[PDB]
Amino acid sequence: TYNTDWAAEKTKIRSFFDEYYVDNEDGSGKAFPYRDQVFEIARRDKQAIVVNVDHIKESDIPDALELSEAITSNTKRYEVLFKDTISDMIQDYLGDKQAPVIDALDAYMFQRLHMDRNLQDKRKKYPPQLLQRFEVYFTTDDAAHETCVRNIKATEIGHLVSMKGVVIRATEVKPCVEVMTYTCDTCAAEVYQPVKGMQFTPPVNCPNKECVEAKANGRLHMQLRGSKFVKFQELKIQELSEQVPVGSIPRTMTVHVYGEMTRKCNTGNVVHVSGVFLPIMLVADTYLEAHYINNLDDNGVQSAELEVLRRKGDNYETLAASIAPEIFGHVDVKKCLLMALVGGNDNSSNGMKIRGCINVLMMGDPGVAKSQLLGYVNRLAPRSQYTTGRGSSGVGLTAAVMKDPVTGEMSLEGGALVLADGGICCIDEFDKMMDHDRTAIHEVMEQQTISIAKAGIMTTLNARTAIIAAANPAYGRYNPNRSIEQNVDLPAALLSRFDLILLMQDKADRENDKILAEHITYVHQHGCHPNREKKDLISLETLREYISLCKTYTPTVDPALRERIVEAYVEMRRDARYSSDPTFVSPRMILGIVRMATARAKLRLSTIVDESDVEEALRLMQFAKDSLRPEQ
Amino acid sequence: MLSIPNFEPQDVKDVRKISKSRNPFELLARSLAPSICGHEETKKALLCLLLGGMEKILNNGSRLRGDINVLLIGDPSVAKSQLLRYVLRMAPRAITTTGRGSSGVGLTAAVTRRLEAGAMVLADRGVVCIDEFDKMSDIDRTAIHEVMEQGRVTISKAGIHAKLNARCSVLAAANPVYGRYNPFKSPMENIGMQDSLLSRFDLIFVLLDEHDADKDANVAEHVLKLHTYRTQGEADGTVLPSIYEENTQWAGIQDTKILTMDFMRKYIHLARSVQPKLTDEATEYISEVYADIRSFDITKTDQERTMPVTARQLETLIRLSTAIAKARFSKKVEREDTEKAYNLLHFACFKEKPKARQ
Amino acid sequence: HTVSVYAHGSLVESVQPGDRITVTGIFRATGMKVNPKQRALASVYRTSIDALHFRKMDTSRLHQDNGETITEERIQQIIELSKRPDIMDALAQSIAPSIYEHDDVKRGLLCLLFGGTRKDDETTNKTKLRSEINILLCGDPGTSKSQMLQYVYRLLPRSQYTSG
DNA sequence: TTTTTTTTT
Ligand SMILES: Nc1ncnc2c1ncn2[C@@H]1O[C@H](COP(=O)(O)OP(=O)(O)NP(=O)(O)O)[C@@H](O)[C@H]1O
Ligand SMILES: Nc1ncnc2c1ncn2[C@@H]1O[C@H](COP(=O)(O)OP(=O)(O)NP(=O)(O)O)[C@@H](O)[C@H]1O
Ligand SMILES: Nc1ncnc2c1ncn2[C@@H]1O[C@H](COP(=O)(O)OP(=O)(O)NP(=O)(O)O)[C@@H](O)[C@H]1O
Ligand SMILES: [Mg+2]
Ligand SMILES: [Mg+2]
Ligand SMILES: [Mg+2]
Ligand SMILES: [Zn+2]
């Protein structure tokens, strides 16, 4: 009740590679992309083929469904047949020519095959892992193969399985043995030993018949110019939050990664994985052997919806309106968040570095959608972390020393601001954090480093992150009788590190309350924003694409803007002296002005800063200043 | 397993009949807890808590909250803990705790290295009852603010970074600041909690033990009538080791009928699964009424304000309208639902000054 | 990350903890036994470096070698430069060039760089009296104290930076 | 054994 006629299966597989096609976009002909990739391997511009099983399933070929089911049910065997058919295709393409020598193993094989000269002999003398030097991987997209970590059980051993999850731990790349080669002392023969699993045992005595009969007692010595190594990496992957049952905690699983799929992940990423579930060589331990990995953080091509925007221009108002369209109003606050999503340029004049990114602090009365805005920003940004004031320690924000109980070792563990490096950290309930936890971010917000000297550890870590924070005023509500410093109960050293500080009030008004009620009740009716003016708005995906495009530019400042910027700084610094209800102003302010001007130039996708951008930065700073004195 | 619903077509027929009757919401609210005299508006609120609102998940992944949260503050010996224990019996997936002996870490989630679930994580898609809520510390109270709104617990400490789902409804009971309600100070002064915490409760009830000879006589007569009762098929020396109720002397309510608790459990189980939608008359009524509630001024009527009023109370109006529409087995929310929701909220919002001050 | 470097022969004990170096060597890989009792090996290999040369020369810092190699001509240029009456200002303002004013603080940092006379017992190799200079900066926010610390940290060969 | 660190009571 088993099928072992491999030649017929090879015929089916080769017919798939010959006959799958996609029509050309101009209608000029047909592309046969799998055999194009085979020829790329033959000319050594490539190292792996990724095959989609659903293309086999939906191909217009006899026995296609049966081939797809057989691949899925015994994937560990069909990899060999795919490698054999691709090797035969490579030899049919190549003919009497030779593939180029690129590495020492290629040089050894090409030299030794013609030393042997000077197919039965080839296949008996050399193992197929050494004769074939490329990789084959499978993928699926149909929802029949979607599972959690929790559901992979005894029925799934040997089958192809697909899942989705979060990466907890990842090792560095290591060399892993695939084929060992030994040579005899006395008789100069060679032994080839392929390795499977996580162990191997080396042979001791020479097996060659002349050496054995002569009893020459020749030892075997291993050689690493002929031996084959491969990139190896290990991961631990956790369940996603939507997959977990009610009132339960997520589970984890170990994943082994080989070859070209290594270095595609680091800690703090969300991935889609396809692989084969296997035991370790009567109760057994198990792991997942990864076949294909995709970062959902990451995934010259442009979408047509983006092409329309890039041709249109003047996009600033639409981009401001497209941030969380369920939330009514707060246009200037959305513009401030839009600038914080992009930021300015890093400067490194004469060895002295200056921070390029922008920091924003939001405050307001209860029930004014601060948490909703922070949640939308966390979804919109590529790499971002979310924390609350109560749920975080000053060691969970920065970095921790971990004492391993198994070994006794000490190691470092990066916190939220380390994981968010190159991106955005959102801190909710910022006023309820302890002072001795809050003072950890002083180095990060200005020098963008974390430096540690504890136990037997002394290092520095990079933390190049923007911080967006939300809080309530000092007694839960703004008090118009108390000063700005009494309403905002933060020290001046911390206050100077924020480029923008905003206040959002809730005040009763008989028309605005009705308009807000109409908007919220429409959202509850239909599940989407009203759009009563029928104006265009941008999808979340293409807004993410546009912001990613904006980050590539580095616009330079015109030297003509000097007098405007400096005069604005002096005029700003006069009021803090001569006011009854002043605020703190320091030399960081003028750098904040330059940052916001360059940020709007990036949003415009221009390469030179304009005085219009300088004026818009000044307008936003004036709005932020006026927010802190309502009804005065 | 030793540690729940059951149905037959006769039971389905009776559910159809009671749903087609004249005032099913009032019948269920009266039938909820008969051996406690009074507290009719709070019983309506507890029925709305047991039914619950509708969660909305929008096209961009944004979420809007569905659960309902209720607070009771009042004088001692006014049956706050008794009503908490009754809701603990009626609701499936329910947990009870006290603020006296709960840390915020144990109430949400703990590091033990491993991550350990707390009570509000364990009660996901369920009910938490908290007694002696005024005895909790503010350091523990500030840990709840994320859970009561976003339905999440987030932790970032040494070696652990994780989200946890904690979507549940909070029912809480407390005593006022001075241990007994002071009539010469305002209700907000007597409650003594900050606006950011008070805004997260859909309904707040202040319960007072007023000396008044009529009410004292009625309450004492009800209590003694419940204490002199014995089952019809029982001998006098014994010791504990259909749709309508039949013996009702213990219940005090003289003539009006009461539903059996098993029928209550079955009816609530079926009515929970109804998924009503909103309509234009409901939308117009809600939008006008919200502006009227915010703009009303209390110096006219010698009343005083019991709650903050924010944008969350508009969502409370929407939630209560859907919860009332569920009890009718209706597929649509109408003005008939929204008027009852407004009357309940307006009862909660305002209170006349106590007789000691008048 | 961290890496193991193996020194053989005359390279042994040629470097201290705290030094910053460049290493040239051979990259190697070795197997490990599953049990120390038995012949079986793990199929994932351990890696290290066999050293061939250590270099510590770096021109971006004040040099690390007691100044043995300076030519007579540059010694005479130094002696000629020392006769300016401006010598304090000329040396002080060249340190931390991107920082505006704070000339008194710059002169203090110049005194920190030079130090006093060493006073040691050579029989016991112990300091009789301290010759190093300690400095505290205390002031308002946004006045470049951390930037001056960064300049002094980058200038010297043996330096450490800690915070909070 | 004794020592050092981070969460909890
Ligand atoms: N202008 C608005 N538009 C839409 N929804 C709003 C608006 N204002 C408040 N809300 C709603 O109010 C609820 C509370 O939002 P939330 O983000 O928690 O407010 P908040 O500013 O965080 N209050 P707090 O966290 O206690 O300081 C959500 O359901 C929002 O949808
Ligand atoms: N109609 C009634 N109204 C009020 N109390 C009643 C009534 N009927 C019985 N009681 C009794 O009054 C007590 C109810 O108070 P209980 O629920 O035990 O504590 P509490 O109300 O939470 N007060 P406290 O815990 O001190 O804040 C019980 O002894 C009940 O048996
Ligand atoms: N006189 C100055 N010369 C050069 N840069 C300056 C000067 N004054 C301020 N700055 C800039 O303003 C910022 C000062 O930051 P910083 O170095 O932390 O000062 P600080 O004294 O450490 N303030 P703080 O650490 O918060 O107490 C940097 O961006 C400097 O480049
Ligand atoms: Mg909030
Ligand atoms: Mg009680
Ligand atoms: Mg500083
Ligand atoms: Zn031999």
Distance, CA of A443 to CA of A464 (rounded, Å): 11
Please list, in sequence order, all residues whose beta carbon lies within 8 angstroms of the beta carbon of residue A131, skipping any fewer than 6 positions away.
A87, A122, A123
Half-sphere exposure of C46 (CA within 13 A, CB side): 11
Q: Report the SS3 class of residue C10.
A: helix
Helix-strand-coil split of chain C, %, nearest 5? 25, 20, 55
Whose CA is nearest the C1' atom of nucleotide D4?
A: A455
Rama region for A509: left / alpha / beta (φ>0; ψ in -120 to 50; rest): beta
**Closest ligand to residue A493's CA:** 3
Tokens at C87, concatenated? 């010598």
CA nearest to A394 within chain C: C164
Partner-chain contact B315 A472, CB within 8 Å:
no
Which resolution in angstroms does this entry have?
Answer: 3.8
Cα separations (Å) of A374 from A341, A371, A499, B182, C4?
Answer: 12, 5, 18, 41, 45
What sign results for the dihedral spanned by CA atoms A110, A113, A115, A117?
A: negative
Nucleotide nearest to A401 (CA to C1'): D5
Tokens at B131, concatenated? 């007694």
Partner-chain contact A492 C141, CB within 8 Å:
yes
Q: Is B149 on the interface with A (CB under 8 A)?
A: yes
B146 to chain A: which residues are within 8 Å by CB? 388, 390-391, 428-429
Whose CA is nearest the C1' atom of nucleotide D9?
A: B103
DSSP annotation string for B86-113:
HHHHHSSSEEEEESTT--HHHHHEEE--
Of B293, C47, B121, B297, the C-alpha closest to A174 is C47
What sign results for the dihedral spanned by CA atoms A555, A556, A562, A566?
A: positive
Task: Read off the DSSP letter of residue A144.
Answer: G
Task: Read off the DSSP letter of residue C15.
Answer: -
Distance, CA of A533 to CA of A554 (rounded, Å): 35
Q: How was this structure obtained?
A: cryo-EM
For residue B259, report the phi and psi dihedrals to the nearest 5 degrees.
-85, 150
Cα separations (Å) of C97 from A274, A574, C92, C101?
Answer: 56, 29, 9, 10
Distance, CA of A147 to CA of A251 (rounded, Å): 13
**Closest ligand to residue B180's CA:** 2
Contact (CB, 8 A) for B91 and A225: no
The whole-angstrom distance between residue B4's C-alpha and the CA centroid of its chain comes to: 23
Task: Read off the DSSP letter of residue A325.
Answer: T
Contact (CB, 8 A) for B248 and B260: no
Q: Ligand 1 pocket test: which of A368, A521, A523 has the largest number of ligand atoms within 8 Å of its C-beta? A: A368
Question: Is A84 labelled a binding residue?
Answer: no
Of A305, A315, A159, A289, the C-alpha closest to A233 is A289
Name the residue type at position A231.
Answer: K
Name the residue type at position B267.
Answer: Y
Rama region for A570: left / alpha / beta (φ>0; ψ in -120 to 50; rest): alpha
Distance, CA of A72 to CA of A156 (rounded, Å): 10
To test the contact with chain B by mutation, choose from A240, A328, A525 the residue with the greatest count of B C-beta atoms within 10 A, namely A525
Report the gap between the CA of B215 and the closest CA in chain A (Å): 39
Contact (CB, 8 A) for A50 and A139: yes
Name the residue type at position B298.
Answer: I
Of A369, A372, A392, the CB nearest to B156: A392
Q: Which residue has the tokens 């006011």?
A: A579
Regarding beta strands C5-6 and C41-55, do their DSSP bridges make them parallel or antiparallel, or are they unpaired? parallel
Partner-chain contact A172 C150, CB within 8 Å:
no
The whole-angstrom distance between residue B129's C-alpha and the CA centroid of its chain comes to: 10
DSSP annotation string for A332-369:
HHHHHHHHHTT----B-GGG--B-----EEEEE-SSSS
What sign results for the dihedral spanned by CA atoms A233, A234, A238, A239?
A: positive
Of A478, A471, A479, the C-alpha closest to A498 is A471
Of A386, A316, A408, A368, the C-alpha closest to A502 is A368
Element (H, E) at A374: helix A370-380
Q: Is A455 on the interface with B (CB under 8 A)?
A: no
CB atoms within 10 A of CB B268: 18
Q: Which residue has the tokens 């920003």?
A: A377
**Binding site membership of A524 for ligand 1 (Cβ less than 6 Å):** no
Paired with A536 in beta bridges are: none
Of A419, A422, A382, A384, the C-alpha closest to A297 is A382
**Strands lying side by side in the sheet with B94-98:** B94-98, B126-131, B168-174, B70-74, B203-207
CA of C48 from ligand 1 middle (Å) equals 56
Q: How far does the CA of A5 sit from the C1' of D3, in Å?
A: 66
For residue B80, report the phi and psi dihedrals to the nearest 5 degrees.
-65, -50
Q: Report the SS3 class of residue B296.
A: coil
DSSP annotation string for A7-51:
HHHHHHHHHHHHH--EE-TTSS-EE-HHHHHHHHHHTTS-SEEEE
Of A371, A359, A490, the C-alpha closest to A432 is A490
Element (H, E) at C126: strand C126-127
Distance, CA of A45 to CA of A493 (rounded, Å): 56
Which stretches of chain B are assigned E, i.e. beta strand?
56-57, 63-64, 70-74, 94-98, 109-111, 115-117, 126-131, 152-157, 160-165, 168-174, 203-207, 303-305, 350-352
CB atoms within 10 A of CB C106: 21
Name the residue type at position B24.
Answer: P
Paired with A109 in beta bridges are: none
Cα separations (Å) of A400 from A421, A454, B51?
Answer: 16, 10, 45
- Directed axis angle between helix A370-380 and helix A331-340, to 10°? 40
Tokens at C66, concatenated? 């007691």
Of B117, B160, B295, the CB nearest to A508: B295
Q: Is B304 on the interface with A (CB under 8 A)?
A: no
Tokens at B315, concatenated? 């969502």
Distance, CA of A198 to CA of A193 (rounded, Å): 14
Q: Is B283 on the interface with A (CB under 8 A)?
A: yes
- Burial bucket for residue A183 (CB in 10 Å: 0-12, 13-18, 19+): middle
Nucleotide nearest to B107 (CA to C1'): D8
What sign results for the dihedral spanned by CA atoms B189, B193, B196, B198?
A: negative
Helix-strand-coil split of chain A, %, nearest 5? 40, 25, 35
Name the residue type at position C116.
Answer: G
Please list, in sequence order, all residues whose beta carbon lies within 8 angstroms of the beta carbon of residue B355, skipping any fewer than 6 positions away.
B183, B210
Regarding beta strands A286-295 and A270-279, do their DSSP bridges make them parallel or antiparallel, or are they unpaired? antiparallel
DSSP annotation string for A187-221:
S--EEEEE--SSEE----B---HHHHHHT---BEE
Contact (CB, 8 A) for B248 and B258: yes
Contact (CB, 8 A) for A337 and A377: yes
- Burial bucket for residue A584 (CB in 10 Å: 0-12, 13-18, 19+): middle
Regarding beta strands A399-403 and A500-504, do their DSSP bridges make them parallel or antiparallel, or are they unpaired? unpaired
Distance, CA of B248 to CA of B35 (rounded, Å): 10
Name the residue type at position B344.
Answer: L
SS3 of B5-32: the string is CCCCHHHHHHHHHHHHCCCHHHHHHHHC
Please list, in sequence order, all residues whose beta carbon lies within 8 angstroms of the beta carbon of residue B22, skipping any fewer than 6 positions away.
none
Distance, CA of A223 to CA of A113 (rounded, Å): 17
Distance, CA of C43 to CA of C48 (rounded, Å): 17
Q: Which residue has the tokens 């590529």?
A: A382
Contact (CB, 8 A) for B66 and A546: no
Cα separations (Å) of A625 from A364, A572, A582, A595?
Answer: 14, 10, 11, 17
What sign results for the dihedral spanned by CA atoms A371, A373, A376, A381?
A: negative
- Directed axis angle between helix A588-604 and helix A562-577, to 10°? 130
Q: Report the SS3 class of residue C8.
A: coil
Cα separations (Å) of B16 from A519, B12, B44, B270?
Answer: 36, 6, 21, 11
Paired with A400 in beta bridges are: A413
The whole-angstrom distance between residue A114's C-alpha and the CA centroid of its chain comes to: 47
CA nearest to C161 within chain A: A451
Q: Which residue has the tokens 């039949």?
A: B246
**Touching B: A residues 523-582, CB under 8 Å:** 523-525, 527-528, 540
Please list, in sequence order, all residues whose beta carbon lies within 8 angstroms of the beta carbon of residue A27, skipping any fewer than 6 positions away.
none
Tokens at A502, concatenated? 């905003």
- Burial bucket for residue A174 (CB in 10 Å: 0-12, 13-18, 19+): middle
Please list, in sequence order, all residues whose beta carbon lies within 8 angstroms of the beta carbon of residue C50, skipping any fewer than 6 positions away.
C6, C8, C25, C26, C28
